[PDB]
Design an enzyme around this catalytic site. Sequence first.
Site, PDB file in Angstrom:
ATOM      1  N   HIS A  31       0.766  -1.229   0.000  1.00  8.47           N
ATOM      2  CA  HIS A  31       0.000   0.000   0.000  1.00  8.47           C
ATOM      3  C   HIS A  31       0.810   1.298   0.000  1.00  8.47           C
ATOM      4  CE1 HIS A  31      -3.544  -2.321   0.339  1.00  8.47           C
ATOM      5  NE2 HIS A  31      -3.093  -2.920   1.405  1.00  8.47           N
ATOM      6  N   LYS A  66      -4.576  -9.889  -7.647  1.00 11.13           N
ATOM      7  CA  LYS A  66      -5.262  -9.232  -6.521  1.00 11.13           C
ATOM      8  C   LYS A  66      -6.332  -8.318  -7.102  1.00 11.13           C
ATOM      9  CE  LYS A  66      -4.619  -6.719  -2.180  1.00 11.13           C
ATOM     10  NZ  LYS A  66      -5.044  -5.311  -2.126  1.00 11.13           N
ATOM     11  N   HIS A 107      -3.314  -3.063   7.786  1.00 11.20           N
ATOM     12  CA  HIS A 107      -4.348  -3.351   6.812  1.00 11.20           C
ATOM     13  C   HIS A 107      -4.891  -2.032   6.287  1.00 11.20           C
ATOM     14  CE1 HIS A 107      -8.220  -4.902   5.286  1.00 11.20           C
ATOM     15  NE2 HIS A 107      -8.785  -3.985   6.070  1.00 11.20           N
ATOM     16  N   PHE A 108      -5.129  -2.013   4.966  1.00  9.76           N
ATOM     17  CA  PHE A 108      -5.743  -0.872   4.326  1.00  9.76           C
ATOM     18  C   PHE A 108      -7.227  -1.207   4.204  1.00  9.76           C
ATOM     19  CE2 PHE A 108      -5.310   3.079   2.193  1.00  9.76           C
ATOM     20  CZ  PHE A 108      -6.475   3.199   1.488  1.00  9.76           C
TER      21      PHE A 108
END
Length: 124
Positions: A12, A41, A119-120
């Site tokens: 990210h 992804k 985590h995004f």
Amino acid sequence: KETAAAKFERQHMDSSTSAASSSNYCNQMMKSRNLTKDRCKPVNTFVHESLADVQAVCSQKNVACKNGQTNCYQSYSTMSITDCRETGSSKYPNCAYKTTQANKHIIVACEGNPYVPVHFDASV
């Protein structure tokens, strides 16, 4: 194994660019960051800010994650971000993405000591 914090950075963060410079940004970055190695992804966001500025989000506005976890935080400020989402022609191993530039707040989940993004969750 790769820590959750390290995976966040790999998936990210892109402190090396201010914004996406072309329509092939996502195609190149999704490949370079190994997000297409095993499967395509389907969606991913990159944040064009310093690492420290993104890490600092863990000290900003608490909000529950999409999944209901309570260790999520929204940035006070908008950030330059690139949204990457698979195109209809994307077909492993020839993964293809649409690049979308935006300036949005981010929501990240945080864990650990130091307390950092793992985590995004969303751009909002």
